[PDB]
């Protein structure tokens, strides 16, 4: 009978304590910006304390010391971590044989296996086996995607409404069936009826769409200078954001990578110029909105 | 600080020049290389102050590369060192160093490749 | 060798577990290895940082001119009938 919180879409961010601990463990050390020699990713349990065979092989091939990495990992990950929990360690080794490693939460497959209590080789794709795996809902997927953001400095971005699409795609690739999709009906409510639930879903859907739109506009308008240089942008820049970008130390490396001709910044700029030329060449009038031109294309094939 | 909309070859060349100046041949080039941001839309520029206090400003025009800027700065550095030696200034000579050993590593790599 | 092995002093470093537990690991422990121990930190040192002498520049220019002449002569060496037919067929398949 007890409900945690009744609010139209307010259970988005995780608990304050776990978010603080995640900002502590999963952090972004200041990258120097030197030339990258190697990019490696491994899966290491935080509970155990030993030198892994693959990381030791990599460090021996590069001539480095694996004991230092093992010591720092076992001194930073052994406390405040469950027993036998995997973590994704991404190591970046530069041309000076200097390595910088970051720790990341387990992958979506590990999260799904832990949530479903299924062990290894207990799941398979439908085109390979012929039958669905254990049934799931698109709420455990939400709770899983809550703990896998792009950067732990801003857990709200990217949006859960976008993370859940990727996690449900991964679950479907694994071979799991769902109740909201791949099934015409969801789990029934005992206290409510079908028509009331349908109209409630409609109103909740429209208000959640309003919330998603306003949050997307907010996050797209307010973004740091690194995000402005690495991602597309069409909004003005504030003086406080300019000052924050100047305070940021990675601004130099970001600017150099963006000025590199094959950067995503240059890709997006060339795409936008090509779209401008496309409108100028296939536009009825001068002030042809891109949306109006898309409607023109849709109505005129 | 902000990046120009159209591809700014001048900005790219000046950033590459700063990168190569940080990676330049010196025991600690960080003590001599400094980077600054101009929010006043000041055109990207370089200012090299020699040991005597004289300043040189390599003009960064459209089409110039980081290699071109380095060539200009090094030719002017040779001329400035000649002026120092003629004035009577005692200059430290060029010799073998860890930068030269690393360049030897790169040279052996190139020789083994082709 | 077992005594003077690398990282052998770690067995004497930690005198007790109390100090090891009190020592809190910071994020700077991950970044303190991204810097060289003796020399300075440099961004990049590639083949494009190898200065060329006067004779090296002359040799490279002569090599580039020889490559240009070799390409010009290969354009006529491969000007055979069947080779031209194959080239134009591949060009048509690429453009279409």
């Amino acid at each position: 009978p007890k409900t945690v919180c009744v609010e139209p879409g307010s259970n988005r961010l995780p608990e304050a304590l776990v978010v603080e601990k995640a900002r502590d463990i999963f952090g972004r050390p200041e990258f120097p910006g030197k030339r990258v020699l190697h990019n490696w990713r491994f899966f290491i349990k935080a509970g155990k304390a030993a030198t892994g065979p693959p990381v030791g092989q990599e460090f021996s091939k590069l001539g480095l010391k694996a004991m230092d990495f093992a010591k720092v990992f076992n001194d930073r990950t052994k406390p405040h971590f469950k027993e036998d929990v995997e973590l994704i360690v991404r190591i970046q080794v530069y041309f000076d044989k200097s390595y910088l490693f970051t720790i990341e939460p387990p992958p979506t497959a590990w999260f799904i296996l832990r949530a479903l209590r299924k062990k290894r080789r207990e799941t398979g794709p439908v085109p390979l086996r012929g039958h669905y795996c254990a049934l799931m809902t698109l709420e455990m997927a939400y709770e899983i995607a809550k703990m896998k953001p792009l950067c732990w400095g801003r857990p709200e971005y990217p949006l859960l409404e976008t993370r859940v699409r990727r996690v449900v795609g991964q679950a479907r690739r694994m071979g799991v069936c769902f109740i909201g999709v791949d099934t015409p009906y969801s789990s029934p409510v005992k206290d409510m009826t079908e028509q009331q639930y349908t109209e409630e879903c409609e109103r909740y859907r429209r208000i959640h769409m309003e919330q998603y739109t306003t949050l997307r506009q907010r996050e797209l308008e307010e973004a740091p200078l690194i995000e402005r240089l690495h991602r597309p942008n069409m909004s003005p820049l504030t003086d406080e954001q300019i000052e924050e970008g100047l305070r940021d130390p990675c601004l130099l490396d970001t600017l150099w990578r963006a000025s590199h001709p094959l950067s995503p910044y240059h890709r997006d700029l060339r795409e936008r110029e090509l779209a401008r030329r496309y409108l100028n060449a296939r536009g009825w009038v001068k002030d042809m909105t891109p949306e109006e031109m898309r409607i023109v294309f849709m109505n005129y094939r | 600080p902000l990046l120009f909309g159209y591809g700014h070859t001048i900005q790219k060349a000046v950033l590459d020049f700063y990168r190569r100046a940080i990676s330049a041949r010196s025991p600690f080039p960080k003590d001599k290389v400094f980077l600054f941001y101009a929010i006043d839309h000041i055109t990207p520029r370089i200012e090299v102050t020699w040991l005597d206090g004289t300043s040189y400003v390599p003009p960064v025009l459209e089409g110039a590369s980081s290699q071109d800027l380095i060539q200009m700065v090094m030719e002017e550095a040779w001329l400035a060192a000649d002026r120092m030696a003629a004035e009577g200034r005692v200059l430290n000579p060029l010799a073998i160093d860890d930068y030269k050993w690393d360049q030897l590593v790169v040279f052996k790599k190139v020789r083994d490749k082709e | 060798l077992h005594a003077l092995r690398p990282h052998g002093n770690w067995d004497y470093l930690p005198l007790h577990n109390n100090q090891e537990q009190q020592e809190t690991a910071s994020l700077e422990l991950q970044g303190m290895k991204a810097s060289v121990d003796i020399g300075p930190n440099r961004f990049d040192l590639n083949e494009k940082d190898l200065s060329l002498d006067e004779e090296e520049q002359v040799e490279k220019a002569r090599l580039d001119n020889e490559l240009m002449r070799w390409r010009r002569l290969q354009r006529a060496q491969g000007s055979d009938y069947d080779h031209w037919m194959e080239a134009e067929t591949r060009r048509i398949q690429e453009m279409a």
Partner: peptide
């Protein structure tokens, strides 16, 4: 009458500590 009726700097960069601490 109708119109008035309608009318009425150079900053130092921050080097990352991995490059600057040495």
């Amino acid at each position: 009458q109708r119109q008035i009726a309608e009318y009425t700097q150079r900053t130092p960069a921050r080097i990352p500590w991995t490059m600057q601490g040495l």
